[PDB]
Amino acid sequence: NSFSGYLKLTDNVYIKNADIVEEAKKVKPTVVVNAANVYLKHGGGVAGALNKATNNAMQVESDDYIATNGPLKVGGSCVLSGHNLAKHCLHVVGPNVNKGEDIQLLKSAYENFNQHEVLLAPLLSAGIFGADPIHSLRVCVDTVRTNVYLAVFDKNLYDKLVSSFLE
Ligand SMILES: CC(C)[C@H](Nc1ncnc2[nH]c(-c3cnn(C)c3C#N)cc12)c1ccc2c(c1)S(=O)(=O)CCC2
Structure with missing residues (x-):
């Protein structure tokens, strides 16, 4: 976990x-x-x-x-092998609001993280799943109680997210 x-x-x-x-x-x-x-x-x-x-x-x-x-x-989620990437992979299904799924399920999705002490994770339901990424970060902060390290592969979005959090 370095x-x-x-x-x-x-x-x-x-x-x-x-x-x-x-x-x-x-x-x-x-x-x-x-x-x-x-x-x-x-x-x-x-x-x-x-x-x-x-x-x-x-x-x-x-x-x-x-x-x-x-x-x-x-x-929901399941735990499978992490292969060469990690000890375990937690496969988590956030709602795809571009396909009509309820955004309220994003809270359920992040709640899966709480069964693991430390996680590397993406911003659930962002990108082509269509959720507002600022909203996804707020649900993450309010829901996850274990230690989560979010990797966001876009400097423009990273800057927007940090500036949203620090308001
Ligand atoms: C918001 C966006 C910047 C972010 N992307 C990412 N966030 C973090 N690490 C990443 N690696 C790559 C990558 C690495 N190689 N390739 C060819 C890709 C791709 N594609 C992309 C990526 C993101 C976060 C969540 C979700 C998506 C995208 S989605 O559009 O795949 C739908 C599922 C939910």
């Missing part, structure tokens, strides 16, 4: 302008969070990038999990 260059927002939330994949390779965290969908199909975005860094091992493991257990619920 996180470097993060800015501490609250006693348990830290943030950095960084690619979560590069962070996971350098830090070797106990847990890395994937921004998953309910069938664990890592087709693009954060999930595709994490799977590619495992050379597709994450996708094969995910398909076997879904065969035995069925899909996740929106707001």
Whole structure:
């Protein structure tokens, strides 16, 4: 868990302008969070990038999990191997509001983080999932009670988020 260059927002939330994949390779965290969908199909975005860094091992493991257990619920999670990125990967499904899912499920999604003492995570439901990223940071700060290190791979958005938090 050798996180470097993060800015501490609250006693348990830290943030950095960084690619979560590069962070996971350098830090070797106990847990890395994937921004998953309910069938664990890592087709693009954060999930595709994490799977590619495992050379597709994450996708094969995910398909076997879904065969035995069925899909996740929106707001839910499962723990699978971290492969070369972490000890464990926490696959968390935030709502996709561009596909009509309820933004109130973002609180449920972040509540999954509280079962793990330390996590490297992306900003849930941001990007093409369509949630307002400033709102997602506020739900993270108000919900997560364990130690979360957020990697946001866009300097423009990182600056907006920090300036929103410090108002
Ligand atoms: C807001 C945005 C800046 C942020 N992106 C990221 N945040 C942190 N580490 C990242 N690595 C990469 C990366 C690394 N390689 N490649 C080819 C990619 C891609 N794509 C992207 C990325 C973000 C946060 C949450 C979500 C998404 C995007 S989404 O659009 O994938 C939908 C799911 C929820």
